[PDB]
Write an enzyme that holds these catalytic residues in place. Sequence first.
Site, PDB file in Angstrom:
ATOM      1  CG  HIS A  41      55.277  44.168  10.514  1.00  0.00           C
ATOM      2  ND1 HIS A  41      56.497  44.809  10.623  1.00  0.00           N
ATOM      3  CD2 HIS A  41      55.485  42.910  10.064  1.00  0.00           C
ATOM      4  CE1 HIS A  41      57.399  43.945  10.174  1.00  0.00           C
ATOM      5  NE2 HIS A  41      56.836  42.784   9.839  1.00  0.00           N
ATOM      6  N   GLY A 143      65.443  43.827   9.493  1.00  0.00           N
ATOM      7  CA  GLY A 143      65.429  44.493   8.194  1.00  0.00           C
ATOM      8  C   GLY A 143      65.128  43.550   7.040  1.00  0.00           C
ATOM      9  CB  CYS A 145      60.341  42.553   7.694  1.00  0.00           C
ATOM     10  SG  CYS A 145      60.282  41.762   9.313  1.00  0.00           S
TER      11      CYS A 145
HETATM   12  C1  LIG Z   1      64.631  41.961  18.752  1.00  0.00           C
HETATM   13  O1  LIG Z   1      63.327  42.508  18.599  1.00  0.00           O
HETATM   14  C2  LIG Z   1      62.634  41.946  17.499  1.00  0.00           C
HETATM   15  C3  LIG Z   1      61.211  42.434  17.551  1.00  0.00           C
HETATM   16  N1  LIG Z   1      60.356  41.947  16.461  1.00  0.00           N
HETATM   17  C4  LIG Z   1      58.951  41.812  16.883  1.00  0.00           C
HETATM   18  C5  LIG Z   1      58.015  41.529  15.730  1.00  0.00           C
HETATM   19  C6  LIG Z   1      56.719  41.099  16.014  1.00  0.00           C
HETATM   20  C7  LIG Z   1      55.804  40.873  15.002  1.00  0.00           C
HETATM   21  C8  LIG Z   1      56.187  41.082  13.696  1.00  0.00           C
HETATM   22 CL1  LIG Z   1      55.096  40.647  12.411  1.00  0.00          CL
HETATM   23  C9  LIG Z   1      57.456  41.530  13.377  1.00  0.00           C
HETATM   24  C10 LIG Z   1      58.391  41.734  14.393  1.00  0.00           C
HETATM   25  C11 LIG Z   1      59.817  42.138  14.068  1.00  0.00           C
HETATM   26  C12 LIG Z   1      60.627  40.899  13.681  1.00  0.00           C
HETATM   27  O2  LIG Z   1      60.337  39.773  14.092  1.00  0.00           O
HETATM   28  N2  LIG Z   1      61.704  41.154  12.887  1.00  0.00           N
HETATM   29  C13 LIG Z   1      62.667  40.231  12.408  1.00  0.00           C
HETATM   30  C14 LIG Z   1      62.458  39.389  11.312  1.00  0.00           C
HETATM   31  N3  LIG Z   1      63.248  38.364  10.959  1.00  0.00           N
HETATM   32  C15 LIG Z   1      64.315  38.129  11.707  1.00  0.00           C
HETATM   33  C16 LIG Z   1      64.684  38.904  12.833  1.00  0.00           C
HETATM   34  C17 LIG Z   1      65.849  38.651  13.600  1.00  0.00           C
HETATM   35  C18 LIG Z   1      66.196  39.478  14.630  1.00  0.00           C
HETATM   36  C19 LIG Z   1      65.409  40.580  14.951  1.00  0.00           C
HETATM   37  C20 LIG Z   1      64.259  40.839  14.259  1.00  0.00           C
HETATM   38  C21 LIG Z   1      63.852  40.009  13.181  1.00  0.00           C
HETATM   39  C22 LIG Z   1      60.466  42.809  15.280  1.00  0.00           C
END
Ligand SMILES: COCCN1Cc2ccc(Cl)cc2[C@H](C(=O)Nc2cncc3ccccc23)C1
EC number: 3.4.19.12
Lengths: 302, 298
Positions: A41, A143, A145
Amino acid sequence: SGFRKMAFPSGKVEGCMVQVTCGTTTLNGLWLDDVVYCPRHVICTSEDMLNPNYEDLLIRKSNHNFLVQAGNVQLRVIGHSMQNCVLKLKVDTANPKTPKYKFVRIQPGQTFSVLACYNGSPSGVYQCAMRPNFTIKGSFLNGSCGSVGFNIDYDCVSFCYMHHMELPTGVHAGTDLEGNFYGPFVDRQTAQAAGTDTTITVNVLAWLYAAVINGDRWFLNRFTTTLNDFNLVAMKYNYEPLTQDHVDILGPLSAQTGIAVLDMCASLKELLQNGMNGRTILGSALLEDEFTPFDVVRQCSG
Amino acid sequence: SGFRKMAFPSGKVEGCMVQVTCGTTTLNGLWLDDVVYCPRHVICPNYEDLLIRKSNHNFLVQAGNVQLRVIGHSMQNCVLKLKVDTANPKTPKYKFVRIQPGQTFSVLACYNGSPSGVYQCAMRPNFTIKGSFLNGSCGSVGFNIDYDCVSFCYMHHMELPTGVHAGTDLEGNFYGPFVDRQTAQAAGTDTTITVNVLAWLYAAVINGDRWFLNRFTTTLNDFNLVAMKYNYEPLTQDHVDILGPLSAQTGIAVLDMCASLKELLQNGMNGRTILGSALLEDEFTPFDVVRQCSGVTF
Ligand SMILES: COCCN1Cc2ccc(Cl)cc2[C@H](C(=O)Nc2cncc3ccccc23)C1
Ligand SMILES: [Cl-]
């Protein structure tokens, strides 16, 4: 004496963390030999998140679109391929700090250490378990990830997890190092939810054996149980069914303490009925389920 | 999201662990530049009389599979300093620091010069640590990482009859009224680290847990009268000042969070948990909460 939630020394893993940048997105990568593994991603943009066609997004990319940073040195990408939900970036330099490693896929209930990283820099290490619902209760911010989970039994590093996303409940979803997700999750921002979680019964029993080895016997009783009667009671408290494999795996701990597995099961049954009554077990007022029978044998004996 | 007991990356410290053998005893040593630091009880008591009888070749130091040759030895309080012929190329930027009770640190537990685990723990107000150590764990070190600099604060020496641990700073001064001798010693009555519990309550609020909050406030004096009744360490004005950033981030005044803690102490959790815990957690400092709820790297 003492029983702590113990993580593996992270040194071998720290020497593999790199920062991966594609356009506006920056996350962590795992540099082993001449390949950098990172979540696929990283190639995704704003609208390309609800329904991203990764094959269509990756075919538009060239090697120079991926910026890889190892400390202050920039690595040159010379190839790229996708393997399920992992992107494999071929680089022109092999990591001299590459340890002896393996890619392992774990089952729910298994534990592992997490080296939490931001911008290719390690910030902390903690121990955690694959929940029966295939999520992990981690500590991750934006971050993180690309951060990885591992075990270091003997001199070899077994990579078992790479972090990809956080679910709406605050729990985390990721993949093995071959890009296959743990659980019914997808690397899409579609409405996804963790299933109802359960307690890892074999782990709680192992932790009760650890308490006995450390001199705590207050919770024991004069009763035994059939494996079937235990499971009927356990299911009522959201505990995972205890199988004959779990009973066999608890054998060494049973012989070391002199308490039959079904005798320890009867004690767990009574704990679930009565609660702790102002008492603790190994400094805890809840029944701990993130120590496996192997973790107990490792810390309580060697 | 998520709040875990988080240790510092141990990599810089792993590259310093060596095995020290004197006669029948084998424990761990810390190899920094051309000196190996280890507990003085490896020679075991009149330590000056025991050390004068030893020569350099009596101390066998092992760094992985390579043997280091000792070219000198001196004592500094309860630490033995073994001068070796080779300076450690993996020596990080380091400092020797002495910590105060309530401060936290990482422990890289070792056996035979080999690191086996890393965990986070705190210096208890009674100067002991609730660690996880077995025979052979002596010489294992406690540290914090500050930017790129490793601050070594602890060297493990012994376990007390209650299962808790006693050790020294890297200059050989024990934490607590302990001595490095086989004798009747006991840990004093322990207390809860109040500033740490408050910091962990702020971490719970940041992570969406607000059930324990209330409309009430308290005076610092009225809180300290209640806290003393529950074996909690006195909360000082410095603790209040240190909780300032967390207070402004969540919008809950420190004495407002103190009023919540007072209600938890008098009435309990009532079948509920805070950050997955049914007990009030006291081994996260205000700085540990800030660093984990902001993701600072090393
Ligand atoms: C607030 O908006 C977050 C959006 N996320 C949507 C999403 C969807 C699918 C995939 Cl594979 C990755 C993500 C991204 C995600 O999960 N990132 C994060 C990872 N680990 C803890 C996280 C705590 C807080 C924020 C983000 C984190 C980004
Ligand atoms: Cl497994």
